[PDB]
Each structure stands twice: as C-alpha cells, then as structure tokens.
Design an enzyme around this catalytic site. Sequence first.
Site, mmCIF file in Angstrom:
data_model
loop_
_atom_site.group_PDB
_atom_site.id
_atom_site.type_symbol
_atom_site.label_atom_id
_atom_site.label_comp_id
_atom_site.label_asym_id
_atom_site.label_seq_id
_atom_site.Cartn_x
_atom_site.Cartn_y
_atom_site.Cartn_z
ATOM 1 C CD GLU A 35 35.010 -20.016 -32.860
ATOM 2 O OE1 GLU A 35 33.808 -20.057 -32.150
ATOM 3 O OE2 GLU A 35 36.060 -20.876 -32.398
ATOM 4 C CG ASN A 46 31.863 -19.808 -23.017
ATOM 5 O OD1 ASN A 46 31.509 -20.564 -23.961
ATOM 6 N ND2 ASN A 46 32.337 -18.819 -23.140
ATOM 7 C CG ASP A 48 33.273 -20.214 -18.169
ATOM 8 O OD1 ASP A 48 33.345 -21.202 -19.165
ATOM 9 O OD2 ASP A 48 33.666 -19.220 -17.903
ATOM 10 C CB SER A 50 32.740 -16.653 -20.075
ATOM 11 O OG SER A 50 33.253 -17.816 -20.315
ATOM 12 C CG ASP A 52 32.540 -17.786 -26.761
ATOM 13 O OD1 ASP A 52 33.232 -17.523 -25.603
ATOM 14 O OD2 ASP A 52 32.918 -18.870 -27.364
ATOM 15 C CG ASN A 59 35.643 -16.857 -23.275
ATOM 16 O OD1 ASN A 59 34.684 -16.282 -22.369
ATOM 17 N ND2 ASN A 59 35.431 -18.353 -23.132
ATOM 18 C CG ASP A 101 47.670 -14.435 -24.898
ATOM 19 O OD1 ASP A 101 48.139 -13.675 -24.307
ATOM 20 O OD2 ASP A 101 46.862 -15.254 -24.119
#
EC number: 3.2.1.17
Length: 129
Positions: A35, A46, A48, A50, A52, A59, A101
């Site tokens: 990562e 990202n 979209d 967003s 990280d 995110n 989650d």
Amino acid sequence: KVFGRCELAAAMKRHGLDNYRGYSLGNWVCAAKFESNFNTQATNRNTDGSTDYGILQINSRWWCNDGRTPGSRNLCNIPCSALLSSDITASVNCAKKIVSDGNGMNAWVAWRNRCKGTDVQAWIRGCRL
Ligand SMILES: [Cl-]
Ligand SMILES: [Cl-]
Ligand SMILES: [Cl-]
C-alpha cells in the site's frame, strides 16, 4: 517516516494487530509494504475523487474526513491528515475498524491481490518482536 520492515512489524505488534480478527502480523506488514512502501506520508488520489492516506492507504470515501470528498463518510472519526503521522496509532486504530467491517482484509485491494494466500510469515522473518 519510512519504516524499516521489522521496525513496522514491531510497531504493529505492540499496537495489537498480530492476529487481530485472525490476521497474522505478516498480513499487516505485507499490506503496508504494497500500500505505502512503509511510508507514513503516502497519499494517492482515487478516480472518484477520494484519497487514500498513510501506511495502510485508508480511504476518505468511508473512513476519514479530508473536507474534499463530497458525500463521503468519516467512520473512524478522524482527520485524514492524522493518518500520515510518524506515530501509527491512528492508522492502526482505524484499520481495526475497517477489518471488522465484513470483508476482512479484502478491504485493502493490495492485500487481496498481493498478500492473500502467500507466505506472509516471510514479512516478519528475523524480526525482534
Ligand atoms: Cl522490505
Ligand atoms: Cl505472519
Ligand atoms: Cl476475515
């Protein structure tokens, strides 16, 4: 801060990630390697809109607030900038929420594609833990 491999393994261990939700320490070190290359200051945008953040590339779409991801959530209740600290506490605490989650460590695409099913124990080889 750019962590050494065993340095990060030890930090993750003391912060309670070894076998957290059944994921051995090497899984976490492997995820961090791919990562962020162990760099706490890693950020990536990202498609979209967003972003990280940090050692585990958490995110802003769901987990932290950066004020520039419209319609997003902040489920770890933290500024995304806190995830960039030399101290990994915030990232670890948020990671614990993420991995609880539902999809486990599959939440980290790099873990699924590069760590999952591999010999992750190799990532903590020789480490003083
Ligand atoms: Cl390495
Ligand atoms: Cl391991
Ligand atoms: Cl799981």
